Every structure is written in structure tokens, then in C-alpha cells.
Amino acid sequence: NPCGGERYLDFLRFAVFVNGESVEENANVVVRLLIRKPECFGPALRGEG
């Protein structure tokens, strides 16, 4: 479902970036949460073909 995940991605983008600078804690948490569920990346970044 490509038209759905864009809203959650933009909410996360708002959560991570503030006033032109990044907040380290939120960025680290988001990256660590994302890497453990690879299916969030869509078919392109799948390792299995």
C-alpha cells in the first residue's frame, strides 16, 4: 500500500526534524526501530531478490 505509508513517514519526519537541526535521541530511536522491521522499506530494499 504505497498511498498509505506516506502519512506515517511524514509524521515521523515532523517528529525527527526541528527548526533546521536534528534531535539525536529521536533519530536513533527511529532508525533502530526501523531496521528491525525491514518490510517497512517496501519491495525495493528487500534482500531476497
Binding site for other proteins (CB under 8 A): 35-36, 47-48
Sequence-distant (≥ 6) Cβ neighbours of residue 12 within 8 angstroms = 30
Q: How far is the CB of 36 from other proteins (least distance, A)?
A: 5
Q: How far is the CB of 9 from other proteins (least distance, A)?
A: 20
Q: How far is the CB of 35 from other proteins (least distance, A)?
A: 6
Nearer to other proteins, 18 or 33 (CB): 33
